[PDB]
Every structure is written in structure tokens, then in C-alpha cells.
Amino acid sequence: HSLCTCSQLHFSEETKQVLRLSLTEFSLPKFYLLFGISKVKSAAVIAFRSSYRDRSFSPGSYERETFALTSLETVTEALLEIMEACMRDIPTCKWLDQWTELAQRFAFQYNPSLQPRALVVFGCISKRVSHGQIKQIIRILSKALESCLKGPDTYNSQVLIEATVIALTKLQPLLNKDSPLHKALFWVAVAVLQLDEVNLYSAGTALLEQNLHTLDSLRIFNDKSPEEVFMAIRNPLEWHCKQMDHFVGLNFNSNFNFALVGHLLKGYRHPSPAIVARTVRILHTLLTLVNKHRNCDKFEVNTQSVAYLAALLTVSEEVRSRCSLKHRSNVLLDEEVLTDPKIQALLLTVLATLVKYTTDEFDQRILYEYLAEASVVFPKVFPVVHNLLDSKINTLLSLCQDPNLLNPIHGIVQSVVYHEESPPQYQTSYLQSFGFNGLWRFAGPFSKQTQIPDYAELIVKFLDALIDTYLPG
Amino acid sequence: HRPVEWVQAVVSRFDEQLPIKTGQQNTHTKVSTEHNKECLINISKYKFSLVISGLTTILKNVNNMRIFGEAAEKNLYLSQLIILDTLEKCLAGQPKDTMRLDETMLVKQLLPEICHFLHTCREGNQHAAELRNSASGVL
């Protein structure tokens, strides 16, 4: 309000309209929640007390809401919009350059109460970043992880990690167009999804989504495929990467697309309905890039572009229509192209996993129809999908009372017995042989007992090696 | 390993829909329980020995059951009717495998229970008439 009613400054008639809209916005019920005073009809009344001379204040209801560093961005970006509007008129203003210096001092200095908040603000306002700055941010994340496992106080240092990731999500689009880290920040995003926490997972996708968006505008996927780009830059530090893949139960050398999809499938289990739609977008953007490399109309089915179509099967209508089951354009599960035993063992584990945890009538219907047709078209490899289907099918047979959902299940039972009476060619442990022994485990729900899985001792070493190779000094 | 245990579920649910057994309103207008029959008939083609053996025990238990009341008798009459009708379809449905190595089941499990109905069975003037016609087709 003081800005709109100040005479020292001469704001043009355009700017004064910007401020007046901001004045009304901040009084909306949306911003009462951001500031943390929801359930308060008016702020003025609570701020002041009438009997302020007679008696002292009497605080109560010590129950105190929490704060989320995502809220701080929304406020921190509303203010930054106001300030820039002013600087257009005020010549040679120094407001933004003074504010940045204040943030940059607390951002890189150890203070467990102010550092997390000073990183979310340093990135939201800064206009230039250098390589020397990025290393400090990436080395605050390395020290944050080590503290978590050593001590028993996690939540204290699990907000200094989410703040380091949020900073990087904003500072990447300002880096130099020819820096290696434009591509090496795809493994930080991947290495963060493996920590199994809703907040860390939520921030990890936000870095990944814009990592693809930025690389597109630089035209780096023009003549190469995702597997080529990210797997080429991982080579110098392959020794450290390999060890992580062993324990997480996924492999990236054997099959890239499926390993990448494995992490993204957990997004469907996130409590917030806003992170579910973000992991769907990351799948489309990856699908349109692999197909463009092969010039295959964006909906063709091949070995490379089959993994991202099973994930979109139950959420994207165009995929279901353009890829229809033969036993009602082209039909998924074609045995002409999917003629590799491995490439067809995984595609069944993806489908079994999506139904083991799903709870929805419309979803279970579509996924079971694609499993019945799989029983006949792929008789030999189907026995590697029993334990995943063992428990839930047994329950459905006993108590299900839906003809639409009970039909496909019966077709599966008949197929199993028909092709039985032969020595199992592929055992249940066929997947552990070539790496993917943890694929079904990694897609479970987020654990209520939030704790670092304790194989984070390797993520520290990987990050440390990443700095040494690409930021020598 | 697992699929053998899957068949048991189809068979086990069959008993829980017999009128004499507590209905529990699981019929769902009989569409849900009728689908179970079609699967059970189909499964017999490849697991004939297992399905047939399970059916005999289900029939044997019903025979060795004592119940009183007009409703009780009516339920048991309709109960045994379903088992026999299903059992006959499996035999007729089964292709001409001509496997003559079912002696074990026939001698003890199956024949004694079918033979019982062929007796005069004067319990019901109208019920026994239908049972013989259905039982005779099985034999």
C-alpha cells in the first residue's frame, strides 16, 4: 500500500495498475493459507488486541502447523513480480542486486534454521549462476545425506535436502549452453527418487521434468536418443554407478527404457493428485522423443518404445484406442517384433505390477484383458508372473461378483492349465539373472516409517565422484 | 505349483453356492455363480482326474447329511440336482480320451454314490422320479 501512495517515486500509470491487482490478490483465501492463518476470518482483528494496556497476552493452542518449502516459492515469486514492476520506472535501481547479496550470504553458511529457506529464495530471484556456485549447492546435498544416516534426527536434515533439489530446479535454465552439467543433472534427479520419501520424490520429478524441457530448447535430442545422451555421459564414472544398480534391483546397461520407467511407476502411488499427473507428463515427453528418433508416427510399437506405452495404457485414451487388444490400428503384444525372450518377460512384469497395487474397477478391467491375451500369445514366458498374480487372483475368484471383471480372470486360469504339464522353461527367478530382481518391489507404496533405505552410503560416493570428474576446480 | 491351488478355489466356491449350504446371497442373481460352473466344466478337460475326485467328496458329504423340515428336504433335493447335472456335462464334454485308468475313483468314490439313487428311493414321489432320470444318464 505504501508503494501505491508514495510521492518520492513516480510510477507510470501502467505500473500502478500492476500493484493494485497485487493488493487484492494477497487478501484472497489462497494467500491466507500460504501465510498459515487459515481459519481466521480477518487478520486485522487477530493481529491487534483491544485490551492491550490492561492485561498481557495469553497464548494458547500450542499445536502449530508445519511449513512446506513449496509454499515459500509461491510467496517469494509473488513479491519478485512486484519488485520488477517498480524497477522498470525507477532508473538504475539497485533493489534486486541488494536483495540477492543478502540471500547469497545465508545460502552458503551453516545454519539449520535459515539455510533451507535461504536456498529456495536464492534460486528464485538470481539471474546469473556460475560453475563455482553449482558445486557448493551439490556439495551441500552430499553433506546432508551423510548426516541423515549417522544420527537419529532425520527430519531436521531432510529439509536441507529438499531445499538443495528445489534450488537446482530453478538454476539450471541459466547455465551456459555448453556445460556438461546440463546433462549430468539427470542422475541427481534419478539418484533422489531412490530415497523413498514423498517430499523428496515430489521434488525429484520437478527437476526431471524441466531437465527434459531445457535440453529440448538447446536441441540436444535432435539426432540422438535419450539412451545415447545420458548413458554416454555416465561412462567416465561407471564403476560407482554399477554398484548402486546392484542393490536397488534395476539395471541400466541391460535395458535403459525399462529401468527409467521403473522409477517413474512409483509416481502413481503418491498421495497428492498433483504428482500423479506430473509423472504422466514425463512419460509422454519421453515417448515423443524416442519415437522421433525412429520416425515412427509417435504411436508405433517397438522394443525401445514399448515400455512407455504400458505405463500410459491405463491413463491415456489415445494409447488404448491406437493400441487395441486383437481379441476384442495396430495391436499391442505383437509377436513379430517382440521376438526376444527378455524384452517380453519385462513387459509382463510391468503389467502384473500395475495391478498388484492398483485399486480401481476401471483400471483392473483394462489390465486383466491385456494379461489374458498375453497368456496365449506368450505361453512360454507367462510362468514368470505367478507370484505377482498369485495372491490377488486367489482372492478375486472367491469373492468377486462382477461379470465384467470375472470374465478375464477365468480365461487366465484356463490358459495356465492348458500349457501346463511341461517342464518349466523359464523359472520365477529368470529376472534376477540379468538384473531386474527388484522391479516389482520398487513400485510399492511409500513407507509410513520414513527412513533412508540405508543404501544411501553409495549415493554419497557417486555424488562425490560426479563433482571430481566434471568440476575439478 | 500355484495353478493347482487356483483350481481348488474354483471348486471350493462351488460348494458355498449349494442351497443347503448357507446361501449368503452370493448368487448375485446366479450370474456370478453360473460363470463358476462354466469354468469348472472347462477345467475338467485337462484336469479331469482332479476335478472329478473333488466332486465325489462334495456329493458324499451331502449324502451323509441329516436335516429336518419341508425347506430342508427341498433344499437337499435341488442341491443334489446341480451336482449331478454338472458332473454329467464333464463326462460328456470330455473328449474321447478313452483313458481306462480311472478304476480307483470308479470302484469306491463314484459308483457307490450313484448306485444309491438307482434304488427305489421312495422318499419323494416326484423328486425320486427326476433323480433317477438324471442319475441314469450319468451312469
Curated annotation (Swiss-Prot), chain A:
Q: Which cysteines are joined by disulfide bonds?
A: none
**Which compartments does it reside in?**
Nucleus; Nucleus, Nucleolus; Cell membrane
Tissues and organs where the protein is expressed, per its UniProt entry: Detected in brain, peripheral nerve, lung, colon and muscle.
Post-translational modification (record): Ubiquitinated by RNF7/RBX2, leading to its degradation.
Listed under subunit, the entry gives: Interacts with HTR6. Interacts with SPRED2.
Job of this protein: Stimulates the GTPase activity of Ras. NF1 shows greater affinity for Ras GAP, but lower specific activity. May be a regulator of Ras activity.
- Disease with which this protein is associated in UniProt: Neurofibromatosis 1: A disease characterized by patches of skin pigmentation (cafe-au-lait spots), Lisch nodules of the iris, tumors in the peripheral nervous system and fibromatous skin tumors. Individuals with the disorder have increased susceptibility to the development of benign and malignant tumors.
What's the protein here called? Neurofibromin
Full-protein residues shown here are 2131 to 2745 of 2839
Swiss-Prot record, chain B:
Which gene underlies this protein?
A: NF1
- Any coiled-coil ranges, and where? none
In Swiss-Prot or TrEMBL terms, this protein is called: Neurofibromin truncated
